[PDB]
From Swiss-Prot, chain A:
This is DNA-directed RNA polymerase II subunit RPB7. The gene is RPB7. Its main location: nucleus. GO terms for cellular component: cytoplasm; nucleus; P-body; RNA polymerase II, core complex; RPB4-RPB7 complex. GO terms for biological process: DNA-templated transcription initiation; nuclear-transcribed mRNA catabolic process; nuclear-transcribed mRNA catabolic process, deadenylation-dependent decay; positive regulation of nuclear-transcribed mRNA poly(A) tail shortening; positive regulation of translational initiation; RNA-templated transcription; transcription by RNA polymerase II; transcription elongation by RNA polymerase II. The keyword Disulfide bond does not apply. SUPFAM superfamilies: N-terminal, heterodimerisation domain of RBP7 (RpoE), Nucleic acid-binding proteins.
Curated annotation (Swiss-Prot), chain C:
Coiled coil: none annotated. It comes from Saccharomyces cerevisiae (strain ATCC 204508 / S288c). Component of the RNA polymerase I (Pol I), RNA polymerase II (Pol II) and RNA polymerase III (Pol III) complexes. Component of the RNA polymerase I (Pol I) complex consisting of 14 subunits: RPA135, RPA190, RPC40, RPA14, RPB5, RPO26, RPA43, RPB8, RPA12, RPB10, RPC19, RPC10, RPA49 and RPA34. The complex is composed of a horseshoe-shaped core containing ten subunits (RPA135, RPA190, RPB5, RPO26, RPB8, RPB10, RPC10, RPA12, RPC19 and RPC40) where RPA135 and RPA190 form the DNA-binding cleft. GO terms for biological process: nucleolar large rRNA transcription by RNA polymerase I; ribosome biogenesis; RNA-templated transcription; termination of RNA polymerase I transcription; termination of RNA polymerase III transcription; transcription by RNA polymerase I; transcription by RNA polymerase II; transcription by RNA polymerase III. It is found in: Cytoplasm; Nucleus. The gene is RPO26. This is DNA-directed RNA polymerases I, II, and III subunit RPABC2. GO terms for cellular component: cytoplasm; nucleoplasm; nucleus; RNA polymerase I complex; RNA polymerase II, core complex; RNA polymerase III complex. Its main location: cytoplasm.
Curated annotation (Swiss-Prot), chain D:
Belongs to the eukaryotic RPB4 RNA polymerase subunit family. The keyword Cell wall biogenesis/degradation does not apply. It comes from the Eukaryota. GO terms for molecular function: nucleotide binding; translation initiation factor binding. Pfam families: RNA_pol_Rpb4 (PF03874). DNA-dependent RNA polymerase catalyzes the transcription of DNA into RNA using the four ribonucleoside triphosphates as substrates. Component of RNA polymerase II which synthesizes mRNA precursors and many functional non-coding RNAs. Pol II is the central component of the basal RNA polymerase II transcription machinery. It is composed of mobile elements that move relative to each other. RPB4 is part of a subcomplex with RPB7 that binds to a pocket formed by RPB1, RPB2 and RPB6 at the base of the clamp element. GO terms for biological process: DNA-templated transcription initiation; mRNA processing; nuclear-transcribed mRNA catabolic process, deadenylation-dependent decay; positive regulation of translational initiation; RNA-templated transcription; transcription by RNA polymerase II; transcription elongation by RNA polymerase II; transcription initiation at RNA polymerase II promoter. Keywords: Acetylation, Cytoplasm, DNA-directed RNA polymerase, mRNA processing, Nucleus, Phosphoprotein, Transcription. InterPro entries: HRDC-like_sf, RNA_pol_Rpb4/RPC9_core, Rpb4-like, Rpb4/RPC9, Rpb4/RPC9_sf. It is found in: Nucleus; Cytoplasm; Cytoplasm, P-body. Residues 1-20 are annotated as: Disordered.
Curated annotation (Swiss-Prot), chain E:
It is found in: Nucleus. Belongs to the RNA polymerase beta chain family. Transmembrane segments: none annotated. Component of the RNA polymerase II (Pol II) complex consisting of 12 subunits. The chain holds residues 1128 to 1224 of 1224 of the full protein. Zn(2+) binds at C35, C38, C54, C57. DNA-dependent RNA polymerase catalyzes the transcription of DNA into RNA using the four ribonucleoside triphosphates as substrates. Second largest component of RNA polymerases II which synthesizes mRNA precursors and many functional non-coding RNAs. Proposed to contribute to the polymerase catalytic activity and forms the polymerase active center together with the largest subunit. Pol II is the central component of the basal RNA polymerase II transcription machinery. The binding of ribonucleoside triphosphate to the RNA polymerase II transcribing complex probably involves a two-step mechanism. The initial binding seems to occur at the entry (E) site and involves a magnesium ion coordinated by three conserved aspartate residues of the two largest RNA Pol II subunits. The gene is RPB2. This is DNA-directed RNA polymerase II subunit RPB2. A zinc finger (C4-type) spans 35-57.
């Protein structure tokens, strides 16, 4: 599920930094406008690998100002969930309408009615929870969810998942 | 490699590009009597590995098309049998600096 | 695309065209009442003040060097050596 | 944005964008036949947790190093040992990575680049597709059912018996705590 | 005044891309900005607060300035409008 996709980016550098250690600045700016980014087509850019052998190529100088433009070809560890993906995480928030599990950098939420039946929701609990014949789900409890649908948004990705199938529930 | 004397029949030649991968070439006797590569002018060329090539580009940040080309029929291109895409490194002498390295891609 | 201050590959030295243009550019500004970063030993000709700012390497500019493919390298008047 | 190794010649009518599901149909950007920078072809890159934990660690570390080549001129124990590696070589605003390292390091199933090595040398004999050869590595599984159900893309590509031996050798190698 | 064929042919010679699009100093001449990533005029240059951006290829760091004959800029914009992309890169990566 986590991936290692081969990407590339374009950074426009002002002449100012056309210094001796330019390579250094580039890379650094690569990492500012990448690590922690988010797209629906790439998912989560989490970490740039092989920091060293980052290919810079020759950048061309634009044509009104001196800013130069290099196509930085890198490689990193991405992660973008899918509908029908099975993943387990740590619960965080839990309310009358359901609880939200946190799978990695993302947050998957489970609808009360997307859970089973015999599982009710106890509001008068502290911390808040969901009780069952034998199961007890609350804050720190670990669950395994099945992602039913995804929704991209700004700089993140949420999604709804169910625990109404088999081999699904706490662990 | 096949060597014809006075010539081949135009009915024949159209049978070489019919069994790929395999490749064939046609040479007339009279053009192989002298090695063209031994001539004072013609400097020496060299084939570049599909590796050595993918490097020449990356080091000069060049696109394939911005590279100096050599003819698919160019005499020396035949002496080595280039293929549309194969690059050659031309190393000659210079009155400005002993040796100058140059490249010729093919078309 | 840009290029790290390291992996830098251009000429450590200032090109005539650069210097030529820096002074000009700088004059232009100085001549426009821009702030002057050097003590005027009494100078009063912009291109002359510019020649001064440029010798105490106190010119706040950066020469972006575009390459044939678009990427660039950024050097500062500070860094760049001035032989000429 | 961050461009992606292939220029899909979009001819005006951009419409067909299939479904994303465990039918192994993933966005165009994740077919199994993608292109490397060198200009070659290369199987997709499927990382199962705790393998990712190692790869992320690996670089974050070799980063700290080459981050000083230029300055001259046990469960809970890893939580601290990493937060540091970060507050050193991270954006410090990569709250995502922080949270990815916890998760990645809490739910992980292997500590030795040697153990994870076998995990790989094992599953990679299946001919199975990368997304499976990942869900398998980071998901506990006792029966072929707990498996072939939480990974439907398997269903017919492997007999229950075999997929079960592999599961046996998984919990065997499953490093302790 | 005139900037005809011949005077163009020289700017092409000089390899003075931008000035052409903008042959130059005595006719067109124009200063545009680019993305070092996607070689287009996209860039949103606020020459003041130095802000630069270029969302989409999303930048802020890698950005160039080139001088080209306005006519050329227009040549490009017109092309883009026909859905064709003219990439302007400031460094050669293809060698030769």
């Amino acid at each position: 599920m986590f991936f290692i996709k081969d990407l590339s980016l374009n950074i426009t550098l002002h002449p100012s930094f056309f210094g001796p250690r330019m390579k250094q600045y580039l890379k650094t700016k690569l990492l500012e406008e990448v690590e922690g980014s988010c797209t629906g087509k790439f998912g989560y850019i989490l970490c740039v690998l092989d920091y060293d052998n980052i290919d810079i190529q020759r950048g061309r100088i634009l044509p009104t100002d001196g800013s130069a433009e290099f196509n930085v070809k890198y490689r990193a560890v991405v992660f973008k969930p899918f509908k029908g993906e099975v993943v387990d995480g740590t619960v965080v928030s839990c309310s009358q309408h359901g609880f939200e599990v946190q799978v990695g950098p993302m947050k998957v939420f489970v609808t009360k009615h997307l859970m089973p039946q015999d599982l009710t929701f106890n509001a008068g609990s502290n911390p808040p929870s969901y009780q069952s014949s034998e199961d007890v789900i609350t804050i720190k409890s670990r669950i395994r969810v099945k992602i039913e649908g995804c929704i991209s948004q700004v700089s993140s990705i949420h999604a709804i998942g169910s625990i109404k199938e088999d081999y699904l529930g706490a662990i | 490699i096949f060597v014809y004397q006075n010539n081949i029949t135009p009915s024949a030649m159209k049978l070489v590009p019919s069994i790929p991968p395999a490749t064939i070439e046609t040479f007339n006797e009279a053009a192989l009597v002298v090695n063209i590569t031994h001539h004072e002018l013609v400097p020496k060329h060299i084939r570049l590995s599909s590796d050595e090539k993918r490097e020449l580009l990356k080091r000069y940040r060049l696109k394939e098309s911005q590279l100096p080309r050599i003819q698919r029929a160019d005499p020396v291109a035949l002496y080595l049998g280039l293929k549309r895409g194969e690059v050659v490194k031309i190393i000659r002498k210079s009155e400005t600096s002993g040796r100058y390295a140059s490249y010729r891609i093919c078309m | 695309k840009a290029i790290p201050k390291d992996q830098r590959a251009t000429t450590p030295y200032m090109t005539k065209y650069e210097r030529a243009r820096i002074l000009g550019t700088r004059a232009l500004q100085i001549s426009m009442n821009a702030p002057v970063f050097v003590d005027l030993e009494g100078e009063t000709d912009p291109l002359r003040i510019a020649m001064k700012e440029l010798a105490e390497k106190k010119i706040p500019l950066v020469i972006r060097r575009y390459l044939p493919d678009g990427s660039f390298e950024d050097w500062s008047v500070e860094e760049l050596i001035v032989d000429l | 944005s961050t461009s992606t190794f292939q220029t899909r010649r979009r001819r005006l009518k951009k419409v067909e964008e299939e479904e994303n599901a465990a039918t192994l149909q993933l966005g165009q950007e994740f077919q199994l036949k993608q292109i490397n920078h060198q200009g070659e072809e290369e199987e997709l890159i499927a990382l199962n947790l705790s393998e990712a934990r190692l790869v992320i660690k690996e670089a974050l570390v070799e980063r700290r190093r080459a981050f000083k080549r230029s300055q001259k001129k046990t469960r809970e124990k890893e939580l601290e040992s990493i937060d540091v590696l970060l507050e050193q070589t991270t954006g410090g605003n990569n709250k995502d990575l922080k949270n990815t390292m916890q998760y990645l390091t809490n739910f992980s199933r292997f500590r030795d680049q040697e153990t994870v090595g076998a995990v790989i040398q094992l599953l990679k004999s299946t001919g199975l597709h990368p997304f499976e050869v990942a869900q398998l590595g980071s998901l506990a599984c006792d029966t072929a059912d707990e498996a072939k159900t939480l990974i439907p893309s398997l269903n017919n590509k492997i007999s229950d018996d075999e997929l079960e031996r592999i599961l046996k050798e998984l919990s065997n190698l499953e490093t302790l705590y | 005044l005139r900037f005809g064929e011949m005077e163009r042919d020289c700017m092409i010679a000089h390899g003075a891309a931008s000035f052409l699009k903008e042959l130059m100093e005595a006719s067109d001449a124009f200063r545009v900005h680019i993305c070092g990533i996607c070689g287009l005029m996209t860039v949103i240059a606020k020459l003041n607060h130095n802000q630069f951006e270029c969302k989409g290829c999303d930048n802020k760091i890698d950005i160039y300035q080139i001088h080209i004959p306005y006519a050329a800029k227009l040549l490009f914009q017109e092309l883009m409008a026909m859905n064709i992309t003219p990439r302007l890169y400031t460094d050669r990566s293809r060698d030769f």
